[PDB]
């Protein structure tokens, strides 16, 4: 059924409201059935399939696959019951401390209580689905890696146990998950049977036989063993023939009921499925900090912004869907779709008595061909799954609940089909609600078409003139999308341009353009968002002017400026002998310098710029494989040109990086109750934490993960422990502080703007930097954007950041060396010797830290006696407070506990941020 067309045909708005209410109350049940995962339902499905196929007959079909799965479960259940009974019989007084071989000692007590809780059949279904779900994953040709399989089984059992528990605490360690998974997987290896057919090398005749469906094994890769589970080829073909995705768990799909509003981090998004506000991969510190902030109640605005982002309804486009369907039905590769590849082709076997270079080349050719074939197959499967979702959800309300990564940027829950996808997935989505085009709708729609061609740096007048100069082309391209002028496929973003051409054709055909109702979103794309935020932070003038902060009637583009600078530099340098200039002088385009310049302020080294320009030079005819010399030369020249172009941003970058370096090399006082045991060098357990204006706390996890071997029934898996703590990473914190800070400031701005737009009754959809609204409400959206950016950047954010660092890392001690000839060093030596000569220890730094903590406890408490004692108690840290120039103090030696100081803020510029209210050419 096509509910969208019925809604559009509704004459009266009251009728529309009644229809929406009826649709929601009817579709609650459909959402409930769509959201629920099928384990027990899979059980009776398999049972019914087996009982119905027992009467009809026996074949080798998908029904036969379900029958054999039912038989596998039926044979599993006695084994699981026997194992659980064996575990339960051990719960009596534990007479033997170390007898019963090693299984009883190391595994029976290890995972006894864990298996006895969940129902056996649920775990059997979980493991069967888990193994039949991840065929050919992790680099294995026809199987999965053992560690990934066992860990996934353990986590699935965790989720099932928690789902049972809430309908009636603790989260299991990684080792327990690994052991449970290994036990179940080994049992299924034992009990898996399937009939196979093959040829005999002696009889040359078919010999029917039975072999286990799953078989453990090991494979090598560059001198490293790698455990692997293998699946028989017959099961592989049956899984391939099992439609596309029928029994393999579909878990995350767009909703139909309006999403549940966010109130706390645990409750949000889907109705009956738990969700989290932050996508914490494996870190517990982020979860703890987010829970503390939510309990305090300082993230309300984030909740409102996410609710507004997830409250907008979507529909699947119809004409674009028809075009995609007609392109896909040809079974080939279009400009965008890679296509479907039929067969796998290989070069013939070379003679073994040939030079080893020939064999090596043949091996590389085979590997490359296999990788290309598999990449094409994966892309085809992804596009096919997207099209299946689009066809299934055609003509019905779609809602996209959102979350935030640890920085704060918003991403939808639906991973496969969402508005952040590629151009094909972006074309297939339009707003459910329709708005009156109005006097300004035509202009903005024409601007959108103009800037989907790449013409986004032209004045609005030039853009509308260009759009109106191609009315015949638009009409021809929209009247027959395929087998015609093919003008839409020449766009920079083809399918969005096709949809906008449809909308323009309809509005041109209409006699009265003002009353036309259009559902097409209009992309208002921010220009150099990172540079804009850097200019707003530092308060620069020239940097603000070059990034369209100041009001002007003509676009200013930094990427074009740097491209022209590079071209002039090379032309001056091309006179004598620069053959690299001969190859690349006029062939320098805005894209390469755009990428390099835009990433430069985040700390891109030479290798990153080289790789970026090499990637953006491959389709520029220079070469297909070897462009590294040209790329290196161009990176050198680009760095030489940009070294002086940005100055205010670089100071903030350097300050943030050095602050990250200082924080990541500091040890606190309180948690040092247990000595670091190295005598001299402690282990650092401090990570950069800061709070954005929206209140969301960002904790850079960036920890050095240590992996160990934990014994399992199958093998010993090499895994890490997420719950376990460990020292932070030295380089990642410094390398990621400024990118994270800039990528969180714009996310905060987007959240504020979305909240205001929702308060103003608008439809808002934001792809990170860019924001989508209707073609009519663009003016109000722009006003809201400017107002909210002004409110966000009316304060010196870096000053508040330094204040937050000072308040949080208040009593932190760094370790550093001092010159022995210094009088202060001699005083510190005298104090340490006087304190620790009678105690016995050789003035160990741990005792000094403990006594400094004691001084902090005494002299900071408001007790008069405690204050007097603190005045009568002096330590190394307490003594070293006379001079505020800690760096200038030090400028062999003995290390002491230097206090943690952060550098002075870079000088804030004299620029008025408010001026951009009239700067129309700032975000468009």
């Amino acid at each position: 059924i096509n509910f969208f067309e019925i809604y559009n045909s509704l004459p009266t708005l009251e009728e529309k409201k009644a229809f929406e209410s009826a649709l929601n109350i009817f579709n609650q049940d459909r959402q409930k059935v769509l959201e629920n995962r099928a384990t027990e339902a899979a059980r009776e499905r398999w049972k019914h399939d087996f009982e119905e196929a027992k009467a009809r007959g026996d074949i080798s079909i998908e029904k036969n696959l379900n029958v054999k799965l039912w038989k596998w479960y039926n044979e599993m259940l006695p084994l699981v019951k026997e194992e659980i009974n064996h575990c339960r019989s051990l719960l009596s007084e534990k007479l033997s401390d170390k007898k019963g071989l090693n299984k009883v000692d190391t595994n029976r007590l290890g995972y006894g209580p864990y298996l006895t809780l969940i129902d056996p059949g649920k775990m059997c279904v979980i493991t069967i689905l888990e193994l039949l779900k991840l065929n050919s994953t992790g680099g294995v040709i026809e199987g999965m890696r053992t560690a990934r399989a066992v860990i996934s089984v353990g986590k699935a059992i965790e989720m099932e146990f928690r789902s049972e528990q809430v309908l009636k605490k603790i989260l299991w360690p990684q080792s327990i998950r690994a052991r449970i998974g290994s036990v179940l997987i080994s049992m299924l290896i034992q009990v898996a049977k399937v009939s196979v057919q093959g040829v005999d090398p002696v009889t040359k005749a078919k010999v029917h036989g039975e072999a286990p469906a799953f078989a453990h094994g090991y494979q090598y890769h560059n001198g490293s063993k790698l455990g692997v589970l293998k699946i028989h080829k017959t099961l592989i073909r049956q899984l391939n023939g099992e439609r596309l995705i029928a029994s393999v768990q579909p878990q995350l799909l767009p909703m139909l009921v309006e999403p549940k509003p966010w109130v706390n981090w645990r409750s949000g998004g889907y109705h009956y499925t738990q969700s989290t506000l932050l996508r914490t991969k494996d870190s517990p510190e982020q979860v703890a900090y987010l829970k503390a902030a939510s309990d305090n109640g300082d993230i309300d605005r984030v909740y409102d912004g996410l609710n507004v982002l997830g409250r907008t309804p979507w529909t699947v486009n119809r004409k674009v869907f028809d075009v995609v369907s007609q392109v896909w039905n040809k079974g080939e590769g279009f400009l965008d779709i890679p296509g479907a590849q039929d067969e796998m082709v290989l070069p013939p076997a070379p003679p073994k008595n040939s030079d080893p270079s020939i064999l090596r080349a043949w091996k590389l050719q085979v590997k490359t061909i296999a990788n290309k074939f598999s990449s094409d197959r994966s892309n085809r499967c992804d596009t096919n799954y997207k099209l299946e979702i689009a066809r299934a959800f055609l003509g019905e309300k779609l809602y996209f609940p959102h979350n935030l990564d640890f920085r704060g940027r918003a991403y939808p829950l639906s991973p496969h089909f969402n508005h952040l996808g590629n151009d094909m997935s972006r074309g297939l989505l339009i707003f459910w609600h329709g708005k009156k085009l109005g006097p300004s709708g035509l202009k903005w729609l024409k601007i959108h078409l103009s800037n989907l061609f790449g013409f986004d740096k032209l004045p609005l007048k030039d853009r509308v003139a260009f759009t109106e100069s191609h009315l015949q082309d638009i009409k021809d391209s929209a009247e027959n999308p395929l087998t015609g002028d093919r003008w839409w496929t020449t766009a920079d973003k083809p399918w969005q341009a096709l949809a906008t051409c449809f909308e323009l054709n309809e509005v041109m055909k209409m006699d009265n353009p003002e009353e036309f109702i259009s559902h097409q979103p209009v992309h208002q794309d921010g220009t150099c968002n990172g540079l804009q935020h850097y200019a707003a932070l530092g308060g620069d003038v020239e940097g603000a002017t070059q990034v369209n902060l100041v009001p002007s009637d003509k676009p200013q583009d930094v990427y074009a400026h740097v491209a022209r600078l590079v071209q002039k530099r090379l032309e001056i340098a091309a006179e004598k002998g620069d053959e690299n200039a001969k190859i690349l002088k006029d062939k320098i385009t805005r894209k390469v310098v755009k990428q390099t310049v835009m990433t430069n302020v985040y700390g891109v080294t030479y290798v990153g710029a080289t790789f970026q320009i090499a990637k953006q030079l491959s389709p520029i005819f220079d070469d297909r494989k070897e462009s590294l010399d040209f790329s290196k030369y161009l990176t050198k020249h680009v760095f030489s040109a940009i070294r002086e172009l940005f100055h205010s941003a670089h100071l903030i970058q350097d300050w943030l990086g050095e602050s990250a370096k200082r924080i990541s090399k500091s040890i606190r006082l309180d948690v040092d109750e247990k000595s670091f045991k190295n005598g001299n060098k402690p282990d650092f357990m401090s990570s950069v934490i800061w709070t954005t204006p929206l209140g969301l706390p960002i904790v850079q996890p960036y920890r050095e993960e240590s992996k160990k071997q934990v014994e399992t029934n199958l093998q010993t898996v090499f895994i890490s422990d997420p719950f376990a703590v460990n020292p932070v990473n030295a380089r990642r914190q410094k390398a990621g502080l400024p990118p994270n800070f800039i990528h969180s400031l714009d996310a905060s701005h987007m959240l504020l703007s979305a909240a205001e737009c929702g308060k103003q009754g608008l439809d808002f959809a934001s792809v990170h930097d860019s924001y989508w609204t209707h073609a009519s409400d663009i003016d109000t959206m722009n006003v809201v954007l400017r107002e909210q950016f002004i409110k966000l950047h009316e304060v010196d954010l870096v000053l508040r950041l330094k204040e937050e660092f000072d308040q949080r890392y208040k009593n932190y001690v760094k370790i550093g060396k001092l010159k022995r000839s210094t009088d202060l060093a001699q005083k510190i030596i005298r104090i340490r010797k006087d304190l620790s000569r009678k105690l016995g220890r050789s003035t160990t730094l741990a005792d000094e830290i403990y006594f400094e903590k004691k001084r902090q406890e005494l002299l900071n408490s408001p007790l008069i006696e405690d204050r007097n004692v603190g005045e009568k108690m002096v330590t190394t840290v307490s003594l070293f407070e006379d001079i505020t120039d800690l760096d200038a103090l030090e400028l062999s030696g003995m290390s002491v506990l230097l206090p943690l100081r952060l550098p002075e803020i870079p000088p804030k510029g004299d620029f008025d941020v408010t001026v951009l209210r009239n700067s129309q050419y700032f975000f468009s």
Binding site: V199, P201, A211, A349, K352, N353, V366, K367, N371
Partner: protein
């Protein structure tokens, strides 16, 4: 004839790329007396001989002086050693070249296209009396080169298309210990298996006396190594240096399937053979239990197995109807 270098000239050099060399002519004299080169090579005058990684070249000079072969060629790419050899052996009948032995293109171009050094192809029945090769791969991380040459022995493509070419190879003591293990020892691995299958080597010289504990004590008697002090090698710091002689022998098995079986049966070494056959493929354990009738074989660990029963296991595995992609995989395991 050819002036042998001395210790002072060697110490004047700066970089040796980690390769350890011996520089006393007495040890080379006794090694050549004991080694019995002249018995296998009926006419050393007509012998055409190739040398790999010469370096110092003292052994080169001693060999040429004592035997006077038809053509003895030095293949080097290291700059300092090449300059040293060019300076010392100026105008010598010794042929100094500048090519890198690591690349197969070096041998291909030097033999086929350029025809500078053309050995004569003989039958694979007896030792090629007209061709001899010498290698000095003593680098820390250059074990892969030796192992690839060992594989090329079986495959017969690199230099063994000419027949049963004898090699006098210098290798680190640990590599020799890995490559000279006997069934039941704790140093047994696939490298030892391929060495035993393709060649019948005999250790000749070894630096560290205490290092002899690693090898099988039974075989030391008929090997009779020549012991020389650790201070004899110029790069005194580093691991000991051993010598092995390579004599390829005829084989009656298929290299690819035997290699697959030995590689997948050496991952689990200490596990009994009863439960390790499952690693070969789906259901291989049942078939191998049915086919094998020697129970002592099933009670033996893969370390205890010698190459004969490895060939046997390969033969049983060929007749198995439900064999996996042993060759149909075509060495496609992982791209990353």
């Amino acid at each position: 004839s050819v002036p042998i270098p001395g210790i002072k000239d060697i110490s004047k050099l700066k970089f040796f790329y980690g390769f350890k060399y011996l520089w006393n002519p007495t040890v080379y004299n006794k090694i050549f007396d004991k080694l019995d080169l002249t018995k296998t090579y009926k006419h050393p005058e007509e012998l055409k001989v190739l040398d790999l990684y010469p370096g110092v070249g003292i052994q080169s000079a001693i060999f040429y002086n004592k035997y006077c072969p038809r053509q003895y060629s030095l293949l080097e790419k290291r700059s300092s050693l090449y300059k040293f050899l060019n300076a010392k052996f100026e105008g010598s009948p010794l042929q100094i070249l500048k090519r890198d032995p690591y690349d197969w293109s070096t041998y291909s171009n030097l033999i086929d296209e350029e025809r500078i050094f053309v050995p004569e192809v003989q039958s694979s029945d007896h030792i090629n009396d007209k061709f001899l090769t010498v290698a000095n791969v003593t680098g820390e991380g250059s074990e892969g080169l030796i192992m690839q040459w060992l594989s090329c022995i079986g495959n017969k493509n690199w230099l063994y298309r000419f027949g049963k070419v004898k090699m006098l190879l210098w290798m680190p003591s640990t590599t020799a210990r890995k490559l000279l293990a006997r069934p039941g020892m704790h140093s047994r691995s696939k490298c030892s298996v391929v060495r035993e299958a393709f060649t019948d080597t005999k250790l000749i010289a070894i630096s560290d006396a205490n290092e002899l504990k690693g090898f099988d004590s039974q075989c030391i008697e008929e090997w009779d190594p020549i012991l020389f002090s650790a201070a004899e090698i110029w790069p005194t710091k580093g691991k000991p240096i051993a010598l092995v002689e390579m004599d390829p022998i005829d084989f009656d098995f298929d290299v690819d399937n035997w290699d697959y079986v030995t590689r997948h049966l050496m991952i689990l070494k200490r596990t009994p053979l009863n439960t390790v056959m499952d690693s070969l493929g789906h259901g291989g354990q049942q078939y191998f239990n049915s086919r094998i009738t020697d129970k002592d074989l099933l009670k033996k660990c893969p370390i205890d197995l010698t190459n004969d029963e490895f060939i046997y296991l390969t033969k049983l595995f060929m007749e198995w109807p439900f064999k996996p992609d042993i060759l149909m995989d075509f060495v496609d395991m992982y791209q990353t």
